[PDB]
């Protein structure tokens, strides 16, 4: 017995609540962007001792 069908195609995309992108500053581009990465990864290295936190750590 098949539960999916062609009438319900694109269901979750339609029902997903719509949240708008918020106005934010433009990101630095080109050499300036590579400058930002260099500082965030190598210059501002705060020691942690225990274990490394990823660039996008959420814990």
């Amino acid at each position: 017995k098949v539960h999916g069908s062609l009438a319900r195609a694109g269901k979750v995309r339609g029902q997903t609540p719509k949240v708008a992108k918020q106005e934010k500053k433009k990101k630095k581009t080109g050499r300036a962007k590579r400058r930002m990465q260099y500082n965030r990864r190598f210059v501002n290295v705060v020691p942690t001792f225990g274990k490394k936190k990823g660039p996008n750590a959420n814990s």
Binding site: L6, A9, G10, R13, G14
Partner: protein, 71 residues
């Protein structure tokens, strides 16, 4: 049904609600599924995928850049 030779194939339509853009008897640009003539993933025996419909890209339709040529 391919125009150049009249052969009949089954083409997968990618993404969430893209089948709604397609209607019956529309000109569709079709490409391979990436496995050089073999089925991809769990879809059984489908070796093709749809890239453009009604001479407009499925991605631009899915991303809201353009709309099914409404006449």
């Amino acid at each position: 049904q391919l125009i150049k030779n009249g052969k009949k194939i089954t083409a997968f339509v990618p993404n969430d609600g893209c089948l709604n853009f397609i209607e019956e008897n529309d000109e569709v640009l079709v490409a391979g599924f990436g496995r050089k003539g073999h089925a991809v993933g769990d879809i059984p025996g489908v070796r093709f995928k749809v890239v453009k419909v009604a001479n407009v890209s499925l991605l631009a339709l899915y991303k809201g850049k353009k709309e099914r040529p409404r006449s």
